[PDB]
């Protein structure tokens, strides 16, 4: 199918509490390979996938150097932003940055993105066309004007259409056993009596990759969305995921319900019935 490479950066100012915390994580699809922490010992970009571990000193030095410049940039950002909003110095604040590129089945560039949040709400985002920006408020306008002035978007676009798709593809080939796989979910159902007149029916999808998956319950063909308890898709820890969906069934009615599992790794929807 299609793939994507994305980098996520978090910076939090620690008033009088040493420099601001900087955390950077890199993913191809739902798998991580990089990760940098200001509090960590190494002060290096560190490998977090097997297929990236033997990239070579040139790579790691180059990646360490750059992510260090990202951390300086964000530390400088937390002050500028404190300015735009006339905030005090005593408080902790958050900057969040994500950028990356999606490629299609052909592994050709599909789209790029570049988003920025302050205190957990949109601040500024490069738009579809990779030419124009969306500013969230009066403060982000100034940034917009500054970035337009400096052709920030052009330099972003060059990265997303070249370097980003280029290395995504290197990784995809290099980690093909991990990155190019699809683990369809192992599915099962469980039944627990709530009472002598109710029972909880739970649909499990386990050990799947990638994370996108739809689990739904029907009763006689009709989707029980309002009455379905659904948990967020969660990491298992081994690079796979899990999810479950539950409904409460009157005892005796288990046969009226079906669970439907859709996942890229399944040659076709999966209808489950407690029988």
């Amino acid at each position: 199918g299609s793939h994507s490479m994305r980098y996520f950066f978090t910076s939090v100012s620690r008033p009088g509490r040493g420099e601001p915390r900087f955390i950077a994580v890199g993913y191809v699809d739902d798998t991580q390979f990089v990760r940098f922490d200001s509090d960590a010992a190494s002060q290096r970009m560190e490998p977090r996938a097997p297929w990236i571990e033997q990239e070579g000193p040139e790579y790691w030095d180059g990646e360490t150097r750059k992510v260090k410049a990202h951390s300086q940039t964000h530390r400088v950002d937390l002050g500028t932003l404190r300015g735009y909003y006339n905030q005090s110095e005593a408080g902790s604040h958050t900057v969040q940055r994500m950028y990356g590129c999606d490629v299609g089945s052909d592994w050709r560039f599909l789209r790029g993105y570049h988003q920025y949040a302050y205190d957990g709400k949109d601040y500024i985002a490069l738009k579809e066309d990779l030419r124009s920006w969306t500013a969230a408020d009066m403060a982000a306008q100034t940034t917009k004007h500054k970035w337009e002035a400096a052709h920030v978007a052009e330099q972003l676009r060059a990265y997303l259409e070249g370097t980003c798709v280029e290395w995504l593809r290197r990784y995809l080939e290099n980690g093909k056993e991990t990155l190019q796989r699809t683990d369809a979910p192992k599915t099962h159902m469980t039944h627990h009596a709530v009472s002598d007149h109710e029972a909880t029916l739970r649909c499990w999808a386990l050990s799947f990759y990638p994370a996108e998956i739809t689990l739904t319950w029907q009763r006689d063909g009709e989707d029980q969305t309002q009455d379905t308890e659904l948990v967020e898709t969660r990491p298992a820890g081994d690079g796979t995921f899990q999810k479950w969906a539950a409904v409460v069934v009157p005892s005796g009615q288990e046969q009226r319900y079906t669970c439907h599992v859709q996942h890229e790794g399944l040659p076709k929807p999966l209808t489950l019935r407690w029988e």
Binding site: E63, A69, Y99, T143, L156
Partner: peptide, 9 residues
Amino acid sequence: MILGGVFXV
């Protein structure tokens, strides 16, 4: 590979 790049909000 991360961005190479500067910036400054």
